[PDB]
Amino acid sequence: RFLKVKNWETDVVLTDTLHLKSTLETGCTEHICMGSIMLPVRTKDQLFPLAKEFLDQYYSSIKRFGSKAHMDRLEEVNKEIESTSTYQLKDTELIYGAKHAWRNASRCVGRIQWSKLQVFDARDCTTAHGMFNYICNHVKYATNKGNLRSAITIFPQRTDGKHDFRVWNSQLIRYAGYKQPDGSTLGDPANVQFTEICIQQGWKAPRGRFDVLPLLLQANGNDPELFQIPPELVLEVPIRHPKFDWFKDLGLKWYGLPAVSNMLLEIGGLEFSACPFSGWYMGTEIGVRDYCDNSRYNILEEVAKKMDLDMRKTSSLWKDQALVEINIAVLYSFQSDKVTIVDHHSATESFIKHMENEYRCRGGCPADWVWIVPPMSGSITPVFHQEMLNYRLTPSFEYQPDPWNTHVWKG
Amino acid sequence: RFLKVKNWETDVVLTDTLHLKSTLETGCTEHICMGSIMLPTKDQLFPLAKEFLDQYYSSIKRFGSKAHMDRLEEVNKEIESTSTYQLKDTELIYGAKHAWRNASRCVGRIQWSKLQVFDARDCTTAHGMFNYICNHVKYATNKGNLRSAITIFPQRTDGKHDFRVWNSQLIRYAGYKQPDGSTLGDPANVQFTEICIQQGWKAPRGRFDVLPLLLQANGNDPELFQIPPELVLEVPIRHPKFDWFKDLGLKWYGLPAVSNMLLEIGGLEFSACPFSGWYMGTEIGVRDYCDNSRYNILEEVAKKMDLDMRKTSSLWKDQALVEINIAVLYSFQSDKVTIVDHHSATESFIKHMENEYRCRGGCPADWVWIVPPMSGSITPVFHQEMLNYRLTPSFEYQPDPWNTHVW
Ligand code: HEM
Ligand code: HEM
Ligand SMILES: C[C@H](O)[C@H](O)[C@H]1CNc2nc(N)[nH]c(=O)c2N1
Ligand SMILES: C[C@H](O)[C@H](O)[C@H]1CNc2nc(N)[nH]c(=O)c2N1
Ligand SMILES: N=C(CS)NCCC[C@H](N)C(=O)O
Ligand SMILES: N=C(CS)NCCC[C@H](N)C(=O)O
Ligand SMILES: [Zn+2]
Numbered sequence: 001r002f003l004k005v006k007n008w009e010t011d012v013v014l015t016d017t018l019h020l021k022s023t024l025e026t027g028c029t030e031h032i033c034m035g036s037i038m039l040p041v042r043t044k045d046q047l048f049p050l051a052k053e054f055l056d057q058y059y060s061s062i063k064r065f066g067s068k069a070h071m072d073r074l075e076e077v078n079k080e081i082e083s084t085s086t087y088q089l090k091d092t093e094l095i096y097g098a099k100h101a102w103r104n105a106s107r108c109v110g111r112i113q114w115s116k117l118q119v120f121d122a123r124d125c126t127t128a129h130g131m132f133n134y135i136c137n138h139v140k141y142a143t144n145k146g147n148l149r150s151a152i153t154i155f156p157q158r159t160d161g162k163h164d165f166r167v168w169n170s171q172l173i174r175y176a177g178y179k180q181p182d183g184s185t186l187g188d189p190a191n192v193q194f195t196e197i198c199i200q201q202g203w204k205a206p207r208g209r210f211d212v213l214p215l216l217l218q219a220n221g222n223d224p225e226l227f228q229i230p231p232e233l234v235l236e237v238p239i240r241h242p243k244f245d246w247f248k249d250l251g252l253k254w255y256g257l258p259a260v261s262n263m264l265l266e267i268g269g270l271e272f273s274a275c276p277f278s279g280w281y282m283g284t285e286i287g288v289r290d291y292c293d294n295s296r297y298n299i300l301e302e303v304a305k306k307m308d309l310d311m312r313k314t315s316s317l318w319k320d321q322a323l324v325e326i327n328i329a330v331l332y333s334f335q336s337d338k339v340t341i342v343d344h345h346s347a348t349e350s351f352i353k354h355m356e357n358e359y360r361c362r363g364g365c366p367a368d369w370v371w372i373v374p375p376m377s378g379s380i381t382p383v384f385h386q387e388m389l390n391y392r393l394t395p396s397f398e399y400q401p402d403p404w405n406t407h408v409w410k411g
Numbered sequence: 412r413f414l415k416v417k418n419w420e421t422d423v424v425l426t427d428t429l430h431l432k433s434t435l436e437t438g439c440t441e442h443i444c445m446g447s448i449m450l451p452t453k454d455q456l457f458p459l460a461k462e463f464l465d466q467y468y469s470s471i472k473r474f475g476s477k478a479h480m481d482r483l484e485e486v487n488k489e490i491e492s493t494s495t496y497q498l499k500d501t502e503l504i505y506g507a508k509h510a511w512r513n514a515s516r517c518v519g520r521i522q523w524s525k526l527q528v529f530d531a532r533d534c535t536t537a538h539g540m541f542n543y544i545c546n547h548v549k550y551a552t553n554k555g556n557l558r559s560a561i562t563i564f565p566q567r568t569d570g571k572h573d574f575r576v577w578n579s580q581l582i583r584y585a586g587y588k589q590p591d592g593s594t595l596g597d598p599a600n601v602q603f604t605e606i607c608i609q610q611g612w613k614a615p616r617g618r619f620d621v622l623p624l625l626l627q628a629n630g631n632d633p634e635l636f637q638i639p640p641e642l643v644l645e646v647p648i649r650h651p652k653f654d655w656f657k658d659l660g661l662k663w664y665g666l667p668a669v670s671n672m673l674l675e676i677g678g679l680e681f682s683a684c685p686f687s688g689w690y691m692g693t694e695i696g697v698r699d700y701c702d703n704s705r706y707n708i709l710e711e712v713a714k715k716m717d718l719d720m721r722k723t724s725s726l727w728k729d730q731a732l733v734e735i736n737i738a739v740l741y742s743f744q745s746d747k748v749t750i751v752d753h754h755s756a757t758e759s760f761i762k763h764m765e766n767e768y769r770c771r772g773g774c775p776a777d778w779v780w781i782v783p784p785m786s787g788s789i790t791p792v793f794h795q796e797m798l799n800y801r802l803t804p805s806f807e808y809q810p811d812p813w814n815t816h817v818w
Contacts (some may be wrong), residue, residue, distance in 0.1 A: 008704075026441060033437045033438075037798075052768055314754035375793065377787075378787050378793045379701070
């Protein structure tokens with residue numbers, strides 16, 4: 001079977017065959033679409049098929065399908081699974097795996113970069129201090145004095161589910177959030193629960209509006225331990241505006257390196273529960289969501305006040321006006337300090353080219369419109385007008401529950 | 412599968428039970444989501460009619476009544492005999508209001524029960540259709556105090572005698588291809604404009620020429636009519652701050668009136684059923700004015716603003732975009748013509764969702780269509796999970812008549 005997607009701005013029509021290799025389920029049925037829903041012990045029984053599937057893909061990509069090395073590897077993995085109940089990936093397989101999980105990430109607009117990922121193999125890591133060291137190295141490498149480089153660090157795979165490696169932080173670098181007695185929040189409200197945990201674990205909180213959180217790292221299923229990222233490794237950018245000299249006096253900054261650290265990487269049926277990865281920011285991530293979401297820093301009011309906009313009726317679009325200025329400031333500040341960032345126009349345009357290329361050379365590109373379309377100025381970006389098909393391919397990045405909800409405390 | 416939806420900004424959680432009444436298909440499967448795809452006999456008829464009459468009698472608290480059973484039997488006898496049936500006026504009004512209620516892509520549904528329904532099933536000719544449409548336009552426009560309305564022409568019989576409005580909206584601006592390659596007026600209507608000219612229309616060839624109506628009664632060849640200009644309310648676009656904005660030469664019409672959809676009630680198909688409410692500002696200022704395939708005015712405006720158009724990261728398009736939409740809203744408000752901004756409209760939709768969930772058990776909603784094309788995440792609907800599914804009565808797409816009509 002074949003499926004057609006149409007761009008309604010250009011009339012370009014593309015044909016998807018790649019969806020036929022989709023195995024996992026979307027959450028939709030014949031009668032209900034769940035396209036806008038945020039979140040819609042593995043035994044020998046299913047493991048080898050999952051392995052074979054991946055190894056077939058790997059060997060096909062390297063033009064060695066059906067070869068002796070291919071057949072020997074399948075044989076080797078089969079015997080290792082029956083003997084040891086799991087298997088270990090070769091380094092080549094791990095790198096391919098990680099790059100493809102990114103490539104298959106339907107919610108990621110930045111996938112044009114997928115093949116230029118730096119993969120750090122941390123499967124020899126045994127302790128939380130070892131994790132801290134690997135993570136510092138990732139941060140220093142990825143940051144690269146502002147010239148950001150995509151990277152992922154991969155900790156040992158899950159075994160029996162009782163010895164998981166986990167990074168308890170949702171991102172490697174994030175600001176603390178503090179709930180005040182009067183109900184207000186100091187810092188980032190998105191991080192209040194995690195902050196409270198850190199403090200309980202013994203973190204001495206500075207209680208400012210932009211405190212970089214400590215790392216909370218769990219090795220081999222043991223209780224997690226606190227570590228402070230050396231401040232010289234945490235690159236930050238003071239936010240100012242090119243025309244508004246009062247903007248700097250809002251006292252805003254942000255960190256340069258976005259590094260998602262709470263997802264699970266699946267490669268050939270193996271589960272990597274600690275696999276922090278990083279690219280670089282699209283401006284709207286910070287300027288629209290981090291700063292302007294009502295449940296985040298929520299700065300629209302204070303910015304609009306300083307702009308002297310008519311804040312009495314919504315139809316003056318005072319929010320829309322302030323939103324644009326804030327986003328200008330974010331991009332201006334990063335560029336001025338020579339820290340990698342991409343605006344939503346450039347990024348979405350690159351994604352369309354990526355997407356078309358993938359259709360031609362791969363037979364498709366799974367994409368989640370709801371996530372791909374930027375949170376401001378939607379229809380003036382080309383992705384708005386692009387039909388997309390969403391489906392699940394492996395290797396993949398998956399959500400997993402926050403560890404504090406599942407961890408069995410040793411004490 | 413008694414599903415939940417969460418608002419991630421407010422943590423409000425709603426439980427959906429209404430989806431279990433869904434009938435038709437979404438286009439999605441377990442393996443593939445098609446959420447962003449734009450267009451995804453006697454024995455058939457009676458179940459459809461029954462399902463509908465059942466809802467109707469339940470809604471007036473007479474489910475299982477003699478009158479309910481009587482009506483069921485009566486309709487069954489009429490279908491068996493005539494191969495079709497006719498709706499009572501009360502059933503027609505209920506069905507139309509509920510088709511709107513069920514329109515998962517419509518953000519304006521808080522108003523669903525206030526619809527004025529004009530029964531035009533006695534219409535036989537295109538001249539009669541024109542008259543009904545002029546009356547609709549005048550009633551709906553109401554000197555700028557717009558009122559929601561639908562006019563329903565006779566239902567399909569054998570598909571050889573369809574009533575159709577060839578226009579996509581009752582009021583739209585013409586589009587012409589210029590010798591120099593560019594396009595004058597609205598590029599979306601270049602093909603329709605061609606056909607009008609082909610049919611005898613005398614085009615002023617301006618940037619904002621109101622198209623004529625091409626009206627089809629009983630399957631006959633369609634016929635041209637000019638809407639009385641005094642019936643077409645337009646708004647010249649000016650900016651409250653930029654005096655040069657008026658020089659741009661922009662206007663738009665006050666009445667959005669979708670005329671090319673198909674209304675299905677109780678299995679019956681109404682192929683000509685133009686309806687109208689009032690504009691959300693972004694429809695005009697974002698989509699009509701700033702789409703690259705429409706009036707595409709971004710660079711002219713940014714030029715006048717003296718923005719730095721050398722790099723995309725200056726966000727000049729974004730700045731121009733906001734100003735334009737300020738001007739649209741300002742203008743309509745100043746001329747006392749109903750319009751709603753995207754902030755107000757999305758907030759009322761969240762309220763409407765709350766109401767539906769509580770009193771009806773759900774509200775089918777299409778996130779891709781409901782989230783406005785600008786400033787998405789600063790509107791509450793961005794953070795609202797929505798379940799999309801198909802309920803009847805419904806409005807459906809149908810093919811453009813010219814690709815079908817046997818001349
Ligand atoms: C290199 C520049 C990159 C850019 C500009 C970019 C852009 C984005 C953006 C804007 C999102 C939505 C994030 C949100 O709204 O919270 C996203 C999601 C995502 N990205 Fe990328 N990304 C980049 C690199 C990467 C890399 C290196 C990986 C993995 C190796 C990756 C994997 C993902 C995944 C799995 C998601 C889904 C996140 C979720 O579901 O919460 N991205 N990306
Ligand atoms: C009264 C105020 C109304 C507002 C503010 C409103 C708002 C909207 C908006 C913004 C859209 C998206 C349209 C687009 O982007 O092209 C839409 C779609 C739609 N509306 Fe409403 N609407 C209103 C009244 C109505 C009425 C009276 C009906 C029917 C009786 C209706 C039925 C629909 C349908 C079926 C769609 C989907 C159209 C399509 O798929 O092309 N609406 N509405
Ligand atoms: C309810 C809705 O699915 C949710 O708010 C989504 C919408 N699209 C998004 N898109 C991106 N990139 N990031 C997000 O967090 C979200 N949130
Ligand atoms: C391809 C995509 O589905 C298409 O551009 C949609 C996106 N969402 C939309 N939303 C509204 N309200 N109106 C539209 O025309 C569209 N177009
Ligand atoms: N851009 C990336 C690639 S690692 N990460 C996305 C998550 C960051 C989040 N949106 C934020 O704005 O802090
Ligand atoms: N608001 C309504 C209720 S009839 N219709 C929407 C379609 C009009 C179109 N989006 C336009 O901007 O001209
Ligand atoms: Zn779906």
